[PDB]
């Protein structure tokens, strides 16, 4: 029956797996401190509102091709060094949520300090809360960090706030949950019934969303790749996934988002028809470029044969320019759709 601190008094603070403030990256007027259980049931289906309003990220490729919705849960799949953390930073910095809650389940405190240092110089620092857990902590504590972060996000949602929740990473959470399961005498192969420790995973993921009577939690879950069974099951639970390919990262393209292998399952629900047409036209161009790349690698492309290939070839530079984005820069929706319009025209 673990309870945790919640409230506006936590804004700008760093919280450990015990629900204790241990550091601050910002100080605010408000000192509101309340207490809530870390284990709450997910909203009833009748309490959930439909995902129909866009959650703008300020990131061109996302806002155009992978448009998120308020209350959506999005997966961020990447191998080590694909820029998952930096993408989190961009999502925080260039979106427009009322409050950001970060749940860091890490293995070293050096990573935690990196995020704390990022927050200390962020323009969103007065509306952020960081919950952390390192390898120095037990598996129980590391799991609770995810519950604490979610519970804090839920209070703000009840208040009517537009909340963005980040869990980095689900893999490390799932790792700890498996060891917590051993303590209770469970393995993934042989589980307990009626309650399994492993079932705290889908229950954790169902808590975000938009409430009819309240605000919303739009959640981003980071998943480590090597494509283990865990990664494919969370892919089935969430409302879409953003895939960071190591190969695009090696080529110097940042963010290394493979839009052709990424999807937002509420995309058609949150953008209008003219957007939809432009997105479909751009994806067709990406697909055409990717086949031209193979032709080039096969040594079957000489300029001047096929007017179509040459047209696609000359579009590669303007396409790569649209996809690329300085991590310090953010784009409005109007700027993004204007840019993608020039790319396909």
Q: What are the sequence ranges of the domains in the chain?
A: 1-271, 272-345
Could you give the CA distance from residue 61 to residue 14 in angstroms, rounded to a whole number?
31
Could you give the CA distance from residue 146 to residue 131 in angstroms, rounded to a whole number?
8
Q: What would the DSSP string read from start to end of 98-155?
A: SEEEEEEE-S-HHHHHHHHHHHHT-TTGGGEEEEEE-TTS-HHHHHHHHHHHHHHHHH
- What is the distance, to the nearest Å, from the Cα of residue 4 to the centroid of all Cα atoms in its chain? 24
Q: In the block, which residue shows the tokens 């970060």?
A: 102
Can you name the residues that pair with 74 across neighbouring β-strands? 220
Could you give the CA distance from residue 14 to residue 23 in angstroms, rounded to a whole number?
5
- Looking from the CA of 40 toward its CB, the CA atoms found within 13 Å total 23
| Cβ pair 42, 206 in contact under 8 A | yes
| Cβ pair 208, 152 in contact under 8 A | no
Could you give the CA distance from residue 63 to residue 54 in angstroms, rounded to a whole number?
9
- What is the distance, to the nearest Å, from the Cα of residue 241 to the centroid of all Cα atoms in its chain? 8
Q: Measure the CA dihedral 56/58/64/69, to 10°.
A: -20
- Here the tokens at position 288 are 């055409």
| Cβ pair 284, 312 in contact under 8 A | no
Sign, CA torsion 48/53/59/61 = positive
Q: What share of the chain is helix, strand, coil (3-state, %, to 5)?
A: 45, 20, 35
Residue 21 CA: distances (Å) to CA of 15, 100, 131, 256, 261: 5, 16, 9, 35, 40
From the list 25, 21, 18, 1, the residue with the least C-alpha distance to 10 is 21
Q: For residue 25, give every residue at least 6 positions away whose Cβ sits within 8 Å of its Cβ, in sequence order, or none.
A: 12, 13, 14, 116, 119, 120, 122, 125, 128, 130
Resolution (A): 2.2
From the list 308, 318, 254, 306, the residue with the least C-alpha distance to 282 is 318
Rg of the chain, C-alpha, whole Å: 21
Residue 258 CA: distances (Å) to CA of 61, 151, 277, 292: 9, 32, 20, 17
- Here the tokens at position 189 are 């192969």
Q: Measure the CA dihedral 217/67/123/173, to 10°.
A: 50
Could you give the CA distance from residue 336 to residue 330 in angstroms, rounded to a whole number?
10
Exposed/middle/buried for 239, CB within 10 Å: 0-12, 13-18, 19+?
buried
- Here the tokens at position 244 are 């960071």
Could you give the CA distance from residue 13 to residue 125 in angstroms, rounded to a whole number?
9
Phi/psi for 290 (5° steps) reads: -65, -30
| Cβ pair 198, 178 in contact under 8 A | yes
- What is the distance, to the nearest Å, from the Cα of residue 12 to the centroid of all Cα atoms in its chain? 20
Characterize the bridge pairing of strands 73-78 and 34-37.
unpaired
Could you give the CA distance from residue 96 to residue 164 in angstroms, rounded to a whole number?
9
Residues followed by a break in the chain (C to N exceeding 2.5 Å) are 226
Count CB atoms within 10 A of the CB of residue 61.
21
| Cβ pair 191, 198 in contact under 8 A | yes
Residues in the chain: 345
From the list 145, 150, 155, the residue with the least C-alpha distance to 180 is 145
């Amino acid at each position: 029956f673990l309870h945790t601190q919640v409230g506006r008094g936590l804004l700008g603070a760093v919280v450990n797996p015990l629900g204790e403030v241990t550091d601050k990256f910002a100080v605010t007027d408000n000192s509101e401190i309340l207490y809530r259980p870390v284990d709450n049931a997910p909203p009833l289906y009748s309490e959930r509102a439909a995902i129909e309003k866009p959650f703008l990220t300020g990131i061109k490729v996302i806002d155009s091709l992978l448009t998120c919705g308020e209350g959506q849960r999005m997966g961020i799949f990447a191998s080590a060094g694909c820029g998952a953390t930096f993408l989190m930073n961009m999502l925080i910095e260039h979106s427009g949520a009322d409050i950001y809650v970060i749940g860091l389940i890490g293995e070293r405190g050096r990573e935690v300090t990196e995020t704390v240092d990022y927050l200390k110089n962020s323009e969103k620092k007065s509306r952020c809360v960081l919950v952390y857990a390192t390898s120095d902590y037990s598996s129980v504590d590391r799991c609770n960090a995810a519950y604490i972060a979610t519970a804090i996000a839920e209070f703000f949602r009840t208040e009517g706030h537009k909340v963005a929740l980040f869990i980095d990473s689900l893999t490390r959470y799932a790792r700890a949950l498996r060891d917590v399961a051993l303590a209770a005498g469970e393995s993934p192969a042989r589980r307990g019934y009626p309650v399994s420790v492993f079932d705290s995973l889908p229950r954790l993921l169902e808590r975000p969303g938009k409430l009819k009577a309240g605000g919303s939690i739009t959640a981003f879950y980071t998943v480590l790749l090597e494509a283990d069974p865990l990664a494919e099951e969370v892919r089935s639970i969430l409302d879409g996934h953003i895939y960071l390919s190591r190969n695009l990262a090696q080529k110097g393209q940042f963010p290394a988002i493979d839009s052709l292998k990424s999807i937002s399952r509420v995309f058609t629900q949150v953008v209008d028809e003219k957007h939809r047409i432009m997105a479909a036209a751009f994806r067709e161009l990406l697909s055409e470029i990717e086949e031209l790349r193979t032709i080039i690698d096969f040594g079957e492309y000489k300029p001047g044969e096929n007017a179509s290939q040459d047209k696609i070839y000359n579009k590669i530079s303007v396409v790569e320019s649209f996809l690329k984005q300085d991590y310090r820069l953010g784009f409005t929706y109007e700027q993004t759709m204007e840019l993608i319009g020039e790319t396909i025209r």
